[PDB]
Amino acid sequence: GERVVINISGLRFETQLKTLCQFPETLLGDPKRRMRYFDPLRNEYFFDRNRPSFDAILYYYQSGGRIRRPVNVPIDIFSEEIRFYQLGEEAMEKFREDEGFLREEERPLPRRDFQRQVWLLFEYPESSGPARGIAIVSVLVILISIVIFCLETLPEFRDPFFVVETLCIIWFSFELLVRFFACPSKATFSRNIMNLIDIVAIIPYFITLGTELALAILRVIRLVRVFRIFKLSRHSKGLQILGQTLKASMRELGLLIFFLFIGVILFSSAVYFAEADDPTSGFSSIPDAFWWAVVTMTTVGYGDMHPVTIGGKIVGSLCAIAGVLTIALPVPVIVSNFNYFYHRET
Amino acid sequence: GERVVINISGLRFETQLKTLCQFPETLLGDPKRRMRYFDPLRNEYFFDRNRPSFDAILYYYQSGGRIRRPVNVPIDIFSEEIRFYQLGEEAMEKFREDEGFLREEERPLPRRDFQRQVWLLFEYPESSGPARGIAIVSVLVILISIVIFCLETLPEFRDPFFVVETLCIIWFSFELLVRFFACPSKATFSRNIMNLIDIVAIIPYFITLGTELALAILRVIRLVRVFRIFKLSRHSKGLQILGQTLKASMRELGLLIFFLFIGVILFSSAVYFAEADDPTSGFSSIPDAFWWAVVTMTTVGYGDMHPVTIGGKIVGSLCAIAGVLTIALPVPVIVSNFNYFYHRET
Amino acid sequence: GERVVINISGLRFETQLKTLCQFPETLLGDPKRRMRYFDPLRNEYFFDRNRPSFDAILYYYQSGGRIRRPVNVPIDIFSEEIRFYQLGEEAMEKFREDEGFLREEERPLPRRDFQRQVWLLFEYPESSGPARGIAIVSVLVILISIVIFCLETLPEFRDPFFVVETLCIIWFSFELLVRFFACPSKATFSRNIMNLIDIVAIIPYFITLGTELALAILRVIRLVRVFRIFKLSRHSKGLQILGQTLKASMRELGLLIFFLFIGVILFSSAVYFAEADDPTSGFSSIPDAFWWAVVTMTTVGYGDMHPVTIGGKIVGSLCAIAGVLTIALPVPVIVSNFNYFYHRET
Amino acid sequence: GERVVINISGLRFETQLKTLCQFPETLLGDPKRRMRYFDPLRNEYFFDRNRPSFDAILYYYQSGGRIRRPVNVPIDIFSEEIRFYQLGEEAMEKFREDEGFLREEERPLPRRDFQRQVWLLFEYPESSGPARGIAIVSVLVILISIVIFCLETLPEFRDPFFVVETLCIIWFSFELLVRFFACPSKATFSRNIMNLIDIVAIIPYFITLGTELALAILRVIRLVRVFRIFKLSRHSKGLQILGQTLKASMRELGLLIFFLFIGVILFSSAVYFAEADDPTSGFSSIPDAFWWAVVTMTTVGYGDMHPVTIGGKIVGSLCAIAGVLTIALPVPVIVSNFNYFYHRET
Ligand SMILES: [K+]
Ligand SMILES: [K+]
Ligand SMILES: [K+]
């Protein structure tokens, strides 16, 4: 173990030989790559490199692999110093993980000439001209199916609607089959959320045709027929960021609903007792003021009834303040999750 | 007093012998633990450790016990350097206090085989299976007592309700007695907020039975019977964080209510004078426009009356702006208290 | 000019003799205070002080008086190093100004035994027991004058009110005269905002008595009689911070009112044209929809009228969004001014 | 290549001669400007300058022109060190770009005695007295044209209005011609937004006079006549910052409108199905509840209809929460753009 002296443009660093040996792939590790940088007269190695960066590089050998960037060094300057010292794609990967950019995954392609083209056209719209044609045709078909849903339920009408709906269902099933049979890995296809959305978009038409050519459940089927709005999430990137935000924030949504429940029970109980002694008062139960407290705490302020007494108006003043306080507390965490996933794109 | 030279991997530090002596428990303090690190030829001590950390360590001896972490050193790296220099569990405790993590308290257990099990089951639900059974049974009993309270006050009914209410009161009193008689220290039991909540949850049933088997006060007793919602704070951690937030923020709540009072008196006075010259106007007093200014400043915007003149609509425009300004000022302090107590958990 | 070497615990600094001379009051400046710190064998001065602090201290001599604190040095540690080097109360004052704590003013006292006591009791309530008695009596008299103002304007009444009002005016004029005749400097008395508030609080009673014992102007006098709420700003510290916030933020309030004006003209013009072709529509002019756009943009959402057409409901949707955007823009600057003046107290 | 030693007040830096040569204009680059700073006995250059700044200066030569300011150095101190080392107006410009102050543009003037005065008076109001007179006359003429627009559409009137409107149009066309014929570069005149606003402000009067002296299109012309509000953006600086904010934030406005569309379709579909089984319910279609969901999600809370069932009130509670969440997400990005462009002025 012999102490070795390294000069980084004036800033001298001294370490024992054993510390450098631990890693051989490094410029310092191999005795013939660093041998050139050595100077015989002063028994020192001279590197005209950046002084702050070397202190971090030296601690990598001392810590057996820990890598950090000094808060006073830009990421790019540190990255080029790491490349110069030849720490390795593994140390560089650790540094990248510390920065917080682990999204290096690259999704595969089908292993054939024909299949790759079919998957590329449907999955990748940025490639060709026909790909953008398929994208615009798909968005237009989704939009006219939404229009058909709402116009179906108008009362002037309640057949062209069945023909337009069956053409939309033919297009949905066609692109689902083409997407399925041209996918590199079938094992991944029943784990994407969007393919499940496409399956739920085409199911209730087929079960209605089946049981109709073979009341509350029919209401359930009619309600399920609204999940065709979420087929726009394949073509919209803000909606995918909204889904990531809502998944990451499930504890805060439960706290929002729980705090609003506690406040609704409390202020409904309080308002009824004050108004119970006035005949003009509209509140007749505690279940009754539940609506009044929801719209007063949220500030929609419809007003199921207007308080008629003095204690009822003091309770209403406190309800209007307490809702602002209650709602404003778990919402900055959800908007921080949104800002994170949204500016992650840059 | 002889100057002693310490080399931290190249970065040389010089101090007098007296400074090291002040603390003997340290590696530098005792003359035989540091003696090995000494090198005779250069009359220097060599440590292959992190250079930024040592400057902070040296100032600990110079300052007679002050310990700080340099803004450019991660907490973990500084913590391991502190352990290496053997400063002590006292210096380490001072460093931890500076970081802001003083919650190291560990609450005791009953000194017996039987008592410890009873306290553990009721106090600690994460232990066993019966503990989670007691937790789920307790939350269900609290929820059906809330449902019984509101259904009691419905007008179609006004006995099964007395039987369900007396079963709920039997369960509440049973677990309160079991919690009390199995507690390591009785002196702490009348200082927890939750045990006071359980006592107030079971009192008015017993005083109603007493004076009923022996009007405004009866109204007070009926209102008190709503504090059974706060028995959910033992099973909910967001509600405990909400109570800590509301205790820490009592000056800001008083400022919110005071600013709203000042604005209500001011804008009620202003609107009445403008509408006094119009017969169609609904405002008849200044006490009268108090409600109109509360719901206009908070934005619930019910509208006790609609202003009928031009000056009354200019005053209403200013009221709607001034409420947003007034309310928005003390609320970021309350949401910062919430974020602090909420992310303290991680 | 001879180079002089200073060692700060290992970290060597070299400067010419002329640089140290520029300031003589410093420990380095005088040749007999620093002479002791000098060591003859190494021709160096040794100081066991903090290394980062000295670099800032040296630049003070080089820059002819500039003083800064390194971002990596706590204010207290730098302050004690400044005191050790004896830079002076002037350099220390410059450092304090850089930190941003210029509020060192100390307001005087009357130059007599009798006057000082009278000024101290009225101006300073934290001194004695009678001082807190005067404070509580003053707040109670202000509160009953507010109650008399609103009860005067009730319609069941419209004399005990004149007697209570004249007792309140006697107390206000009494403490104003006692405050005036016991003030160290009369030149400052007609520049405080609170003494002007007290004068405007007692004026309209005296001019009403004068012209009544000697219609729109009477309305003006009645409106002026509401400035007795602002007499609570002497006893409330949140109201003084609110006044400082509102003075510092006058450009942002003008921008808020200007943006709301622009939006009201724009959306009133747009809604009327869409509803002009429908007889059922309530909008009849552009002046008419001014109220509807104010309450839709602010979200009070009273609704002067409900849009009856499809274009009118598209315009109403855009009005409801645009008001949130317009109002939310200049308000974070006002809440930053509030947070600054409010946490300035600590 | 010979190593050269530079001492910055004790802090020694060593570099090879070739690195200094790369830039000759620098004090170090030329062999006769730096020759004076050299000291023969120690073979070192001595500079009593700031030690942190030099490390950044040295990396400029090593990196072939990269310039950065250390996070621990104030901008002014670094700027004066850059000037001392004579790096150049090019290196200084790179440093300024890194700081983020690229607005150094200086707009020209007409090349004649007469033209320069005419352009200066109209373009620059801060120069003279007549310039402020032209500014105040212009703002007054714009304000009375807005008043004439709204009073035209009152129903008591529907000629003095044509005379006032034609005087306003004469003034607008006069200052547009004077601004045009006195402009240094005509190529820039059809690219300013404000000159396009002035042209659209004077067009529909002339096309109405032309086709009237030669129904939906007439409605379009009447609507276009509202763009005279935007002629105030020349005299208002908050409105110019609002236009810059709205241009920089076009993706966030599209996301706001898209999220509100998705929520309106979803909650309209949900509320109708719950209320379809109740005759008292007002919702009759899904197109019908579109208004109800817009005003519930935005909190204006007019209420097209009031839900009459229990499932309809659970859906209404969720709509009132979801609108707050949906709207609150893309709005902090727009207020950050506002704060940036607004505090850019200082
Ligand atoms: K609202
Ligand atoms: K509202
Ligand atoms: K309303």
Numbering used by the authors:
A (entry chain C), B (entry chain D), C (entry chain A), D (entry chain B): 103 to 260, 293 to 348, 360 to 491
Task: Recite the paper's sentences.
The Kv1.3 channel is a voltage-activated potassium (Kv) channel that is abundantly expressed on T cells where it plays an essential role in cell activation. Potassium (K+) ions leave the cell through Kv1.3 which makes the cell membrane more negative (repolarized), and thereby sustains the large driving force for calcium entry that is needed for T cell activation and proliferation. When Kv1 channels experience sustained activation they undergo C-type inactivation, a process that diminishes ion permeation and is thought to involve a conformational change in the selectivity filter that disrupts ion coordination. Here, we report structures of human Kv1.3 alone, with a nanobody inhibitor, and with an antibody-toxin fusion blocker.
First, we solve the cryo-electron microscopy (cryo-EM) structure of human Kv1.3 without modulators as a reference. We expressed and purified full-length human Kv1.3 and solved the structure using single particle cryo-EM to 2.89 Å with C4 symmetry in 150 mM KCl. The VSDs are in the ‘up’ position and the internal gate is open, reflecting the fact that in the experimental conditions the channel is at 0 mV and not at a negative voltage which would otherwise keep the channel in a resting conformation with the VSDs ‘down’ and the internal gate closed. We observed the P-loop appears to adopt two discernable conformations in the short region from Tyr447 to Met450. Accordingly we designated the two subunit conformations in our Kv1.3 structure dilated 1 (D1) and dilated 2 (D2). The first dilated conformation (D1) shows the apex of the P-loop folded outward relative to the reference structure. In this conformation, Asp449 of Kv1.3 is directed upward and away from the channel, and in particular is displaced from Trp436. This is significant because in the active state structure the corresponding Asp (Asp375) orients downward with its carboxylate moiety positioned near the indole nitrogen of Trp (Trp362). The D1 state may be an intermediate between the inactivated state and the conducting state.
